[PDB]
Symmetry: D2
Subunit: 261 residues, 4 copies
Amino acid sequence: MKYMITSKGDEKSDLLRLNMIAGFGEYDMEYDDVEPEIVISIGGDGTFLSAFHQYEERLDEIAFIGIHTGHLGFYADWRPAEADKLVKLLAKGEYQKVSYPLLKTTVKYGIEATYLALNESTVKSSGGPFVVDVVINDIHFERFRGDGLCMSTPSGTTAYNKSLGGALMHPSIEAMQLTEMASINNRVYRTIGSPLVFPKHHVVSLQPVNDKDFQISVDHLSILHRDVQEIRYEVSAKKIHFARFRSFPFWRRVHDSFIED
Amino acid sequence: MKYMITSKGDEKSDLLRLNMIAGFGEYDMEYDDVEPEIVISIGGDGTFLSAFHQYEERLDEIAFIGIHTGHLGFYADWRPAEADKLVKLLAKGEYQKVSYPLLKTTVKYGIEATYLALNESTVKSSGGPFVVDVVINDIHFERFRGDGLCMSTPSGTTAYNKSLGGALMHPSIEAMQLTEMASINNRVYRTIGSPLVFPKHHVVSLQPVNDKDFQISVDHLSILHRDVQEIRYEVSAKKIHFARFRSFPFWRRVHDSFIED
Amino acid sequence: MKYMITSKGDEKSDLLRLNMIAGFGEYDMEYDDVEPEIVISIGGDGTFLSAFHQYEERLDEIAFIGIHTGHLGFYADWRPAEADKLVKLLAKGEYQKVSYPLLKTTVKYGIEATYLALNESTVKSSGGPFVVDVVINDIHFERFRGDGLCMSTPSGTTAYNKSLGGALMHPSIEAMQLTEMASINNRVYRTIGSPLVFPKHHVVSLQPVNDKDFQISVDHLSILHRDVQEIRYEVSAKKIHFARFRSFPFWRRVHDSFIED
Amino acid sequence: MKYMITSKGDEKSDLLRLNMIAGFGEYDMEYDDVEPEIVISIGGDGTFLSAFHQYEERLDEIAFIGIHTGHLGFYADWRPAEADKLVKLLAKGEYQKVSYPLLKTTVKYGIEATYLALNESTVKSSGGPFVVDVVINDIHFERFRGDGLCMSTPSGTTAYNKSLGGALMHPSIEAMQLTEMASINNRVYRTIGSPLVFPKHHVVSLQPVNDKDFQISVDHLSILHRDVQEIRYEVSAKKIHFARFRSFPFWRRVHDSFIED
Ligand SMILES: Nc1ncnc2c1ncn2[C@@H]1O[C@H](COCC#Cc2nc3c(N)ncnc3n2[C@@H]2O[C@H](CNS34(O)(O)CN3C4)[C@@H](O)[C@H]2O)[C@@H](O)[C@H]1O
Ligand SMILES: Nc1ncnc2c1ncn2[C@@H]1O[C@H](COCC#Cc2nc3c(N)ncnc3n2[C@@H]2O[C@H](CNS34(O)(O)CN3C4)[C@@H](O)[C@H]2O)[C@@H](O)[C@H]1O
Ligand SMILES: Nc1ncnc2c1ncn2[C@@H]1O[C@H](COCC#Cc2nc3c(N)ncnc3n2[C@@H]2O[C@H](CNS34(O)(O)CN3C4)[C@@H](O)[C@H]2O)[C@@H](O)[C@H]1O
Ligand SMILES: Nc1ncnc2c1ncn2[C@@H]1O[C@H](COCC#Cc2nc3c(N)ncnc3n2[C@@H]2O[C@H](CNS34(O)(O)CN3C4)[C@@H](O)[C@H]2O)[C@@H](O)[C@H]1O
């Protein structure tokens, strides 16, 4: 079965990668980083995010696995010590796959670009004050004034979304969540304040009021977009697929990362 | 078609009720408060909540409609001025129904009681410190120390849940949301802090650590339960059905209640 | 020098107390629990709070010391292992005293009671909805609707106040801080949301709107007051005095209790 | 008496300025924008902030007055309609002055710059992750990871500080308040979370961990500083002085701006 392995690139991760490749050499496994069916990420969540984006055009054909040699490792299911066990289990395969929802971002300009996010997409201004009209299914909902906004996938809810006061949501829920960054609320300016959770097929559109340049982030990447007419958020029809070899429930994953381990 | 009408019981609501009954008298409509098919609530959200609980054994057979003569009226779809229009539309009927999810609470004792909630169920102690173990699908998630906990339905997310920092969630999502009330967090005591959103079939169990007496609220009602072994939360298989005669989207409803109207 | 020792009353705390008394027996120290000059509390912060309230009529004549045999021990400056060192240092004395500000609560009835708080005073309703008008120096500031309110001293800011989202304030600042418990905010009801910090000589008055019965807590104690006309908060002219034998800065105390130790 | 007038520069503000100058022409008043004793700002709070910074070297010799022709106008004490009344009152003078505290920011480099703030000073990274060690009076308090930090004066507490969850503090308190922007908190990273309120003479030092370039804002102005060794916050010994002609208490000012007016 075709596979590839990304590494965070420190000594520990590179050696683990070389050892797994050698172990894979003893099975019917072909290393192919053009059309892998299995993508193994060795590092932290940042390494995993880069792996996802390296293959976002073949998400339907790929199952991902994370090994944590980083610090927190939320998308990670394996410690390095279980690597040979994972080689052996991946060989002979017949594992189960689980799918998490993704967020689609569309950026339209004056005179379209689309992005897929595993954690979140955020919008801030390019220096000046950030002011957008928030339009939900063509209904004008609020005029947001503040630092910015964050639209999170379910598995992203434990990331930036959490730091912004968002809810943690189980990834079996096909939804996206919008959180505020430092909104202004006085006699003159009013936002909802609360995080908002949207189902599939709801469309959230941000429309500039004055300045039309924004800093748009998708996961680890942040780009200055100029002459923006609209930013559009919706739950993607695409999903990321994980190879799972044992039970590691999301809420236990949350417990292990935030409560104690 | 069998119907009944509850009133908040002030002069304005009673007269509106008498006028609608008289208007219904001109159609094939039978006033029946034992087995109504249509339940009209005239008042505020508290009146609507009481109407729901008055008929929680026949939720499958009933479509609800709220008229607001109260203050905020979140479950309300009609102003009093549209009552005769509603009489006429309900007559000839063939409206569409929409369903919102409900929360099931199970309270087990030493030596079972179940409740259905349209807004939320909360737990506090009976005086002493509130300490429970939070168990999610049999996995020990956290030991909660604080004032109490709140488990909200989707349509309840705009109520107590919102004041506790919870997310607002569209009611097409079959989920429940757990929020903390004033948790303690120091070197010794740790909670997740964040609201948690659970899908159908997930079970959240609260288990006492020391004191076993709790004040349990379901919507407007609050009961002291003694000798509690477990409180169990799950998304109910039952749903509340609304009669809808025009589009009034949830997010517009949220806008009208919190942003401006 | 006259002294007394309170104990949490578990085996560890009682024995430590008996050993310190025996050690004090070797100096010019007289055990007197009617008019002590030194009050030693052996336990946790709850034990310390009870010690403070046991002698709140002689705060001017007393210096307090806390020894932690409890769990967190925020008012504690000594581990049990340093008890004999403390006996010896207290003997020969000439320590320095530090003073923390206190909160005065006045409860007036239809047809006056005053309380002193080291941590905080809170107000909730006696069952029904909690609604009070908040009056600051005779200026009507807001109508608060919600679960309740909390007025904290500086040293209390790390306690209930912290769980309610309040700021942590250094106790050299003569101030009190008001935090909200789960306020309602919609089109119809509005509160400031933010914690408020008041200086000396500012008076914050809570005035009932409908129900006049409230559950008023002062530190560990909670009393049902009936027929309340007004609850009045002000920074007390009285201060609690600590005996300090070494530097243990407040911000280090905060670090040790919340960050790591 | 020497005076000058700044304008927001829209038609309404320029004409009001020309009319006040003409009215001042009828008294013993000399227009002098080099060494004014009175500085009148006509606009919003942004105009007032620019006026303050235009004369921050002569704060001891100047009393400020704000007239609001902008939107919210928190530092404003006059509506345009009261301008001639203000001309007349300023003439004959003998008003009272009130002083608000200020924040001093010191930025030290490898191989010193100081700033004065009326609202706040904030720090963010120059692109990469923001990580600083927070040192309070030479005691290492926490390692902050997140979007940034905000240090607010008392009168600044109603501004950015409020949006970040900070407490509102009366400006008679000589203090500064530190709030977090989106801190990370998991098993590995821990911050205090809560706003911190510091008295005079306490020094809060931010020390870089990896990246040494930061975006530092003081009130309306934001500068990229490179090769930073330390950012130092302390309550300034300098104060801003306001000319007050009538009672407009801070808490009423807060009420008028956030509750209703
Ligand atoms: N202010 C902020 N607060 C909180 N998160 C923020 C903030 N700004 C940006 N992010 C996040 O960064 C991500 C990019 O980096 C890779 C990742 C991830 C990551 N995913 C998750 C996840 N699903 N659940 C739990 N933890 C996660 N992580 C953990 O997030 C930490 C982030 N490293 S970080 O340096 O803290 C400021 N960070 C650059 C690590 O622990 C990592 O394990 C973006 O997708 C934002 O979600
Ligand atoms: N601290 C709290 N903060 C916020 N809500 C709280 C708190 N405590 C209890 N509740 C709530 O009360 C309900 C019982 O009363 C009837 C209802 C309702 C109600 N449903 C909703 C809803 N789905 N969406 C928006 N607003 C709603 N309302 C509005 O809630 C106000 C409540 N009246 S109230 O007096 O405020 C303290 N209240 C007794 C009214 O405006 C009403 O229209 C419980 O089911 C709790 O959800
Ligand atoms: N929801 C709440 N969240 C947070 N605190 C709450 C809440 N409700 C009430 N309180 C508090 O309880 C106090 C009475 O008890 C004694 C004390 C104290 C105490 N003082 C402090 C302090 N200055 N700084 C840091 N920690 C403190 N402590 C620590 O507070 C814990 C409290 N034990 S507790 O059981 O948690 C719900 N608690 C009864 C212990 O760790 C103790 O060391 C009241 O004066 C409220 O301030
Ligand atoms: N995310 C944020 N949330 C909240 N405030 C933020 C945020 N970012 C920056 N600031 C603030 O901006 C200031 C610079 O501008 C001038 C000012 C002021 C200003 N002072 C105050 C004050 N003492 N009390 C109450 N309101 C104030 N104002 C009101 O602040 C609004 C700000 N205009 S704004 O565009 O909102 C994002 N703003 C550029 C206006 O209403 C104004 O009247 C900085 O000193 C930050 O304090």
